[PDB]
């Protein structure tokens, strides 16, 4: 086997070590090795996708802007689930379909802007 040495900051190490004692790992090396294993494990043209994001609806009238943006590409949209989590925040999940290339750009149009948080895209190609 081989060895790779990396420099890690204190807080990150405090969090890694926290999970180390608990999770029952001998040390940092073993924990990191497992995390890498899963990360790498978790890695077509047509398919589906799930886009989730959080945003304040009033902010910049963002709600209106996101809906029109989606309507500009409604052909790629199957449907959206919306949950009014609090007085100002909205949680939306858009199920998208079509060309993975166009879906990915459509995703950038929606979440790559101010007022949108926790944006995540999950692709599911056929």
Ligand X SMILES: OC[C@H]1O[C@H](O[C@H]2[C@H](O)[C@@H](O)[C@H](OCCCC3CCCCC3)O[C@@H]2CO)[C@H](O)[C@@H](O)[C@@H]1O
Site for a second copy in 35-64 (CB under 8 A): 35-40, 43, 48, 50, 52, 54, 57-58, 61, 63-64
What is the rounded CA–CA span in Å between residue 20 and residue 29? 10
- Bridge partner residues of 93 (DSSP): 52, 81
Compute the residue count for the chain.
126
- If we measure between CA atoms, which residue out of 3, 55, 54, 63 comes closest to residue 28? 3
What is the rounded CA–CA span in Å between residue 119 and residue 94? 11
Site for a second copy in 7-36 (CB under 8 A): 7-10, 12-13, 15-16, 19, 28-29, 32-33, 35-36
What is the rounded CA–CA span in Å between residue 120 and residue 108? 10
Site for ligand X in 36-75 (CB under 6 A): 38, 43
Q: What are the structure tokens assigned to 86, written together?
A: 């609090």
Residue 25 interacts, among a second copy, ligand X, Ni ion, none and using kind-specific CB cut-offs from 5 to 8 Å, with ligand X
Tokens 């420099």 belong to residue: 7
Residues that bind a second copy (CB under 8 A): 1-10, 12-13, 15-16, 19, 28-29, 32-33, 35-40, 43, 48, 50, 52, 54, 57-58, 61, 63-64, 67-68, 70-72, 74, 77-88, 90-91, 93, 95, 118, 120, 122, 124
Which residues sit at the interface with ligand X, rule CB under 6 A? 19-20, 23, 25, 31, 34-35, 38, 43, 119-120
């Amino acid at each position: 086997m081989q060895r790779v040495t990396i420099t890690l900051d204190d807080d990150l190490l405090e969090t890694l070590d926290s999970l180390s004692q608990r999770r029952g790992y001998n040390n940092r090396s073993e924990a990191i090795r497992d995390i890498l294993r899963s990360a790498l494990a978790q890695e077509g043209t047509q398919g589906f996708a799930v886009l989730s994001y959080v945003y304040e609806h009033e902010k910049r009238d963002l709600a209106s802007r996101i809906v029109s943006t989606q309507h500009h590409h409604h052909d790629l949209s199957v449907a959206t689930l919306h949950v009014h989590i609090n007085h100002d925040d909205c949680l939306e999940i858009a199920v998208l379909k079509g060309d993975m290339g166009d879906v990915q750009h459509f995703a950038d149009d929606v979440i790559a802007q101010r007022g949108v948080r926790h944006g995540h895209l999950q692709c599911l190609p056929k």
